[PDB]
Amino acid sequence: MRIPLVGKDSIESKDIGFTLIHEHLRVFSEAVRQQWPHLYNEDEEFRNAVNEVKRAMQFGVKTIVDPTVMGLGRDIRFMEKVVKATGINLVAGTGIYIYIDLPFYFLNRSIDEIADLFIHDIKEGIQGTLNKAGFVKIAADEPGITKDVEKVIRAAAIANKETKVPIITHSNAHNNTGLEQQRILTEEGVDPGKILIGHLGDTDNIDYIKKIADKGSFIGLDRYGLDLFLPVDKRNETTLRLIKDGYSDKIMISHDYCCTIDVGTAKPEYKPKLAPRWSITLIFEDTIPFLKRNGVNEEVIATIFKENPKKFFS
Amino acid sequence: MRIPLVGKDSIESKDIGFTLIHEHLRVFSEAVRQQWPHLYNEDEEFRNAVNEVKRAMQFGVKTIVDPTVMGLGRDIRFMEKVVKATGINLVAGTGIYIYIDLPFYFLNRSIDEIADLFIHDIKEGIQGTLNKAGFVKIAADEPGITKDVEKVIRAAAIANKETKVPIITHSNAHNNTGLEQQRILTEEGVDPGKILIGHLGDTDNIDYIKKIADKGSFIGLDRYGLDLFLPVDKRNETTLRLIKDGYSDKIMISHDYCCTIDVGTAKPEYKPKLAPRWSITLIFEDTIPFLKRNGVNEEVIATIFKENPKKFFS
Ligand SMILES: [Co+2]
Ligand SMILES: [Co+2]
Ligand SMILES: [Fe+2]
Ligand SMILES: [Fe+2]
C-alpha cells in the first residue's frame, strides 16, 4: 500500500510497528568481493545476520530499515534469504554511498541519469527483483560536500519529489555536512520531515543537533555501541537532554550495527578497544532502561521507535 | 612455462608473438553493474569483444594483454568465454585501479595485506579459477600520488619481487605521475626493465618520455585512437621521433581500446569527435603503415610488438 518490503507485500505505515531505523544486515566493498571472493564467507555472514535479526525480534523489533546501497554492497537476494529465515519486516533502499568521487561510470552523466537509477529501484525493482526501495540513501563525511557528493544529494531530491520516499543520510557529526545536506535537499523542494540526518549521535554539541531538528528533519542518534565515535554514556546524556528539552518528535535511535562488515577497522581484536558491547540490541539492554529510570515514560519511547518512523514513511 | 594464459597452458615468453600490450575486452564499475545490472548487456559485450579480437587476429596479432583489474571490472570467466571463441592468447593481470582512495575494505590494512591479494592472483588463481595473473596493474592520475595510491604502488613492488611478474601502470602524461611511479618502484627494488609506464603517448613532450626510458623503463604509447588525449598524427610524430633518436627497444604501442566501456564519456554520440577511428586495429590501418613509409624497417616493428613484450615478460 505504501511501504515496500523485501520478500513481502507492501504495508501501510500504521503497520510498521517498533522499528530500528538504521541497521546493516551486511556491508562490503562491491569491487573487492567481486575481485577477491576468497576473502568472504557467505555462510557465516548469513548466520550472523539471521541470529541478530532473531534476537532483535525477541525484543519486540517488528521492522528493520537497512541503508545498505551502492558502495556498501547492497544485495536484495541476500536480504531476501534473511527475511525468509526470520519473518522480519525489512525495508530496502536505493542510493549511492560515496565520500569523494563517483565511480568512473558517472563521468559525463547528468544528475537526472543518477536520479533515474533511484527511481528505477523505487518503481521497477532492485537488482532485477520485484523488491522495491522504500527510501533513498546518500552520504558525506570528512571530505565535505564535493562536486559528486552534491550530484548525489540533488539526485535524491529528484527521486523524492517523484516518488515521495523519505531520505536517509550518512554524515560526519563534526564538520556541518549534515546541516549542508539538509540545506541542499530542502532547497530542492524536499520536505524536511522526509529527511533523516544521520550519525548526529556522534557528537556532544547539542546546539548543532537542535539546529537541524529545528529545521524540521529527524536527527539520527543512530550509532549506539560504536564507542570510537562516542561512548554509550555520553550518547545517553545527549539523548536524555534532547528528550527533556522536548525533541522526541525528531529523535530517531538505532545502532548502525553491521552483522558483518569487511572494513579493516572491524577486526575482532579491535572489538574491545572502541566497540565492546556493540550489537543490534544494546538499545534494549542499556539505552532505553537508562532513559526509563531517568523519568522518560513509555509514551516517549513509542514516539521515537514507532511514531517517528511511521511519520517518516507516510 | 613463463606467461600464464587465460583458458590455456602457459607459454614460453619466446612464443608470445605479435602482441598488443594494453587492450580491454570489457570495462565497467563493479559497484554500478552490481546495483543496476539493467544498464548492461552481456550479449553485446561478448559479441563486440569477439568481433574485435577476431579482426585483430586477422592482422597477425597473437597475444593480447588485458590490464583490466579491480576498479575496471575484471572478470576471467567473461575472459575465458572470449578465449574459447577466438583462440587468442590472453594475458590477465592483477592489481588495483584508483585515482584517489582505496575502497573502505582497506582502511587500517597494511601494504603487505594488499600485496597478498596480488600474490594470490599470481600464485593461486583469479576469482576462484585456476587462471593466473601475469602482471600487476597500478594507476595514478590528476589527483597525483595520493597516500592510498602510493600504498598500491608499494604493494605491486612486493608482488613483483615475490613473483617476478612485470608491472604495467596507468599514469597521467602531464602531471609527472609516471616518473613518480617509476621512482618509488625502483626504490623498492623493482627492476626498471620490468615496468611499463603507460599513457605517455598522450603527450608530445619527448624530453619527459626519454627521461623515463633513460631510467630503464618501457614507455607506453598505448592510446592510439583516443584523440581527446592526443590526436593520432601527433602521436605518430612522437612515436617516429623516439624511434629516430634510438628508443625502439623501450617503446611499446597499443590502443588501450575498450571493446565495451560503461563510462558516459564513451557514449556513441561523443565518439565522432573524441575518438573517430578508435578500435583495436587502428595501428594496422594508420600507425604501422605510417612508420614503414617513413624509414622504419620490419626489424624495428618486430622489436616493438614482439621483442619488447617478450623482454617485458622475462
Ligand atoms: Co553511515
Ligand atoms: Co589506463
Ligand atoms: Fe550505516
Ligand atoms: Fe587501459
Spans of all domains in chain B: 1-314
Q: Entry resolution in angstroms?
A: 2.6
Residue A28: name the closest of A8, A4, A49, A7 by CA. Answer: A49
Q: What are phi and psi of B96, to 5 degrees?
A: -135, 140
Name B16's Cβ contacts closer than 8 Å, sequence gap at least 6: B3, B62, B63, B89, B306, B309, B310, B313
Confirm or reject contact between B118 and chain A (CB < 8 A).
no
Backbone region of residue B256 per phi and psi (left: phi > 0; alpha: psi in -120 to 50; beta: other values): left
Q: Do B267 and A104 touch (CB under 8 A)?
A: no
User: Could you tell me the three cell numbers for B283?
Assistant: 595501428
Number of C-beta neighbours around residue B9 at 10 A: 7
Residue type, B203: T
Which of chain B's residues have a Cβ under 8 Å away from the Cβ of A101? 99-100
- Measure B281 CA to nearest chain A CA, in Å: 25
User: Could you tell me the three cell numbers for B133?
Assistant: 595473473
Q: Are B243 and B291 in contact (CB under 8 A)?
A: yes
Number of C-beta neighbours around residue A108 at 10 A: 12
How do beta strands B94-95 and B89-92 pair? unpaired
Locus of grid cell 530499515: A65
How far is residue B255's CA from residue B298's CA, in Å, rounded to a whole number?
20
Q: b/e map of A158-169 (b: 16 or more CB within 10 Å)?
A: bbbeebebbbbb
Residue A238: name the closest of A213, A215, A258 by CA. Answer: A213
Q: How far is CA B312 from CA A20, A182, B147, B303, in A?
A: 56, 54, 28, 12
User: For chain A, what is the largest distance between any 2 Cα atoms, rounded to a whole number of angstroms?
Assistant: 56
Q: Are A91 and A254 in contact (CB under 8 A)?
A: no
Q: Exposed, middle or buried, A138 (CB in 10 Å: 0-12/13-18/19+)?
A: buried
- The answer on whether B38 is annotated among ligand-binding residues is no
Residue type, B163: T
Residues forming beta bridges with residue B64, ordered by sequence position: B20, B90
Fold annotation for A1-314: TIM Barrel (3.20.20)
Residues forming beta bridges with residue A29, ordered by sequence position: none
- Positive or negative, the CA dihedral B306, B307, B313, B314 is positive
Q: Are B181 and B153 in contact (CB under 8 A)?
A: yes
- Measure A108 CA to nearest chain B CA, in Å: 5
Residue B139 CA to ligand 4 centre (angstroms):
10
How far is residue A265's CA from residue B2's CA, in Å, rounded to a whole number?
39
Q: Are B260 and B48 in contact (CB under 8 A)?
A: yes
| Determination approach | X-ray
Q: What are phi and psi of B84, to 5 degrees?
A: -65, -25
Q: Are B26 and B68 in contact (CB under 8 A)?
A: yes
Strands lying side by side in the sheet with B195-198: B94-95, B136-139, B167-170, B195-198, B218-221, B251-253
Residues forming beta bridges with residue A96, ordered by sequence position: A70
Q: Do A36 and B117 touch (CB under 8 A)?
A: yes
Locus of grid cell 563486440: B48
How do beta strands A3-5 and A218-221 pair? unpaired
Number of residues that this document lists for chain B = 314
Q: Do A263 and B100 touch (CB under 8 A)?
A: no
Which of chain B's residues have a Cβ under 8 Å away from the Cβ of A262? 104-105
Name B189's Cβ contacts closer than 8 Å, sequence gap at least 6: B157, B161
User: For chain B, what is the largest distance between any 2 Cα atoms, rounded to a whole number of angstroms?
Assistant: 56
Confirm or reject contact between B109 and chain A (CB < 8 A).
yes
Q: What are phi and psi of A34, to 5 degrees?
A: -70, -35
Residue B56 CA to ligand 2 centre (angstroms):
20
Q: b/e map of B172-192 (b: 16 or more CB within 10 Å)?
A: bbeeebbbbbbebbbeeebeb
| 3-state SS, residue A63 | strand
